[PDB]
Amino acid sequence: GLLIFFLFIGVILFSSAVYFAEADERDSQFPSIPDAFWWAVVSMTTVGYGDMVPTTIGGKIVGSLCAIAGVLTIALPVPVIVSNFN
Amino acid sequence: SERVVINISGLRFETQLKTLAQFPETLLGDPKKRMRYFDPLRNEYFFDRNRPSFDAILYYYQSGGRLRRPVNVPLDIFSEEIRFYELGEEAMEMFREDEGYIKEEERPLPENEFQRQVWLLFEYPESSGPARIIAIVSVMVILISIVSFCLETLPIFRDENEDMHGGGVTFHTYSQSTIGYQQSTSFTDPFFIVETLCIIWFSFEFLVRFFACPSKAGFFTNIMNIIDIVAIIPYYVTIFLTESNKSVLQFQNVRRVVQIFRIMRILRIFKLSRHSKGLQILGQTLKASMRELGLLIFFLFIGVILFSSAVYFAEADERDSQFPSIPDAFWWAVVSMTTVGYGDMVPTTIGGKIVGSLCAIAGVLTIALPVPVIVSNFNYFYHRET
Amino acid sequence: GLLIFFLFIGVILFSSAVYFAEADERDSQFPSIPDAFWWAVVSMTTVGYGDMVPTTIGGKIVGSLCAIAGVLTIALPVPVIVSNFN
Amino acid sequence: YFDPLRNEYFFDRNRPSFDAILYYYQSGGRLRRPVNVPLDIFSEEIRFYELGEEAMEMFREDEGYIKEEERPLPENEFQRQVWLLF
Amino acid sequence: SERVVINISGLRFETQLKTLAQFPETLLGDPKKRMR
Ligand SMILES: [Cs+]
Ligand SMILES: [Cs+]
Ligand SMILES: [Cs+]
Ligand SMILES: [Cs+]
C-alpha cells in the first residue's frame, strides 16, 4: 500500500510541476494536470514510453527529478516484499 | 560407570568411561593412548590445548556421532583439534561435508607417456609456456571466428553481388546467401577461407583432446566438449547438404535446414567458456537456479496474460487501438513489465492507461523476487573460487 | 570486467538471433548483425530507446528473452561493487 | 542421578543447553534457546529434562514453527476415497 | 613441565610453564613480571 501511496504522492507533485512548466507552449504535450499523470507514472516506474515528453528547460528539469525520485520510491518497499517472499 | 575427568587448560570436563569407550580407536577412547595425559595426583587427564573446541569433541561421544563445530570457533583451529583427538577420517570427512567443503578429482593421462604429455597443453594451460600459448592462440581463433561470422551479414560485403540491384538471382549467388560465404575448393571467398581456417583449428582441438583423453568414457559428458563439437557441426553438415543437393531446385528444398545450421554457428561464442572462469561460474549459477529461473518465467507469463487481456478490452472500443488481439498485447505486456518499454505500443484510453500503470508496477515487483536468490547463487560460486 | 564481458556475450547472441528472425523482411530494422548490437545493449540495460524494435513473432520472442537476460546479467556483478562502495 | 559422595546430581549431557534449562526455573517460565545451540539438540534436552509439552509448544512458537491440520473425509468410505484424487 | 594456574576474576586457567616461557618478553612469560 505504501508503494501505491508514495507513487500517488509523486504523480500528483510531478504532474503538477510538469504541467505548469510546459503550460505556456502551443505544442505542450500536457493538456491538463490529470493528463500528466500518465507521464509521471510512466517515468517514475521508469517504463518511460516516450509518448509524452517535456520540451522546455523547466519541464526537463522537473522530468529529471521525477526520474530520480521514482527510482528511490520503488526501491524502498520492495526489499521487504522480497524478504517476505524468501 | 567409572567417571572420567578431563581438564582442558583448566576447564573441567567429566563423563562416563563407557561414553568414551564407545569409540575405541580415538585418543580418549584408547587407554594406551590417553595414559600419557593422566595426572595421578588429581585423578584427571590434562591437555594444554584450546578450550572452546572441547565441548564439541566431548559431545561427539555423548551424542554418539554428532560432530559440529562451535559457532564461535575458527575452522582451522577446530580441524586441528579433531585431528589431535584422533576422531578418525570417516568423521572428519562427514564433518567437512556439513561444514561446506567437499570434492576432488583429476588423474593425468593413464601412462600414455605421450598421451598424458599432450593432454597437458590442450587441457591444462597451467603447465608450461607452450601450453599457455595454445590458450592465447585458441582464444584469438575464437574471437576471429566470431568477428567473421558477424561481418558475413554486413551488407557492405553481401551487397556486392551479381543481383545487388535485382536482376538474375544466380544459384551460387543464392546458396552464398543462405550460407554467408561461397564454398569452393578454389577458396576464392575470403569468408569461406577464415571460416575454414577456424574450423581446422577447432577440428584440431577436438580431435587432439579426444585422443589424448584419459577417460574417453565420459568425454561427451563434459559440457565443455559438447560445445567443441557443436562449434563445428554446422560447417561439415552444410558441406554435406550443399553436395547432396547441387542443383538450384534441390538446394531450395533443403534451404530451411541450411539456414538453421547457419544460426547454430553463433553457439561458437560459448567456446570461450573454457578460458573464462566467470563464464563457468555463470553456468553453475544457472544450473543451481533452475527453480527460481523458472518461477521468473512463470510469473512473467501469468502477468503477461492478465495485463494483455485487460489492456485489450480497455482499448477495444477504439478505431485506433494499438492492440488488435490479446495475443498481440503480449509484446506490450512483456515490454512494459521488464520495463524495457519500447513505446511501439501504448494504451490511449483512461482504462488502458490504468491497466498500464498496474502492469508497470507489478512488473517491477515480479522480477525483483527471484533475482536475489540467483544473485546469491552467483556470489556463492564466484567467491568459493579460493 | 565480468559485467562488460557478460554484456558482450549477450549482445552477440541476441543480435544474431534477432537479425535472423527479422531477416526475411522488407522493413527489417536490423540491416546486419553488427547493426543489432545497439538494439541489444539498449534493451539489455533496458534503456530501450525504441529506435529499433523487432516486428516478427520470432524477433519479439528473442526480444523478450533479451530483456529478461539483461536484467539478470546486470543484477549480478552490481551487489559486489555496491559492497566495495559501502 | 544423585552422587552421594559429592552431594550433587550428575548428568553426562550437553553443556551449552543447561544455562537455559536452569534459567527456565529461575525466571519462572522463560525458555529461550541459547543463540549458539542448534535447535535439534536443544529440543532433545527440553524433552530429557521433561519440561512438559505446554512449554515445548510455547518454545516452538517463539522459535518460529507452528501449525498442523488436515483430516481425511470423515468416514465416508467412498467420500474420503474420491477426496484423495481431486 | 611444572604446571601454572592463572585465575582471571575466578575463571580458572592452567598451562605448562614452558608454554608461557615460549615468549620471555611478555608479562606471563617473565618471572619478574608476573611475580606481582
Ligand atoms: Cs525505457
Ligand atoms: Cs522509449
Ligand atoms: Cs532495478
Ligand atoms: Cs528501465
Residue numbers in the entry:
A (entry chain B), C (entry chain B): 325 to 410
B (entry chain B): 32 to 417
D (entry chain B): 68 to 153
E (entry chain B): 32 to 67
Show the paper's wording.
A CTX complex with the paddle chimera channel in the presence of Cs+ shows that toxin is bound but that Cs+ adopts its expected distribution (i.e., similar to its distribution in KcsA in the absence of toxin) with an ion at S1. It is difficult to tell where in the electron density map the amino group of Lys27 resides, but it is clear that Cs+ competes effectively for site S1, despite the presence of CTX. The mechanism of competition put forth above predicts that CTX should not bind with high affinity in the presence of Cs+. As shown, this prediction holds: CTX inhibits with a nearly 10-fold reduced affinity in the presence of Cs+ compared to K+.
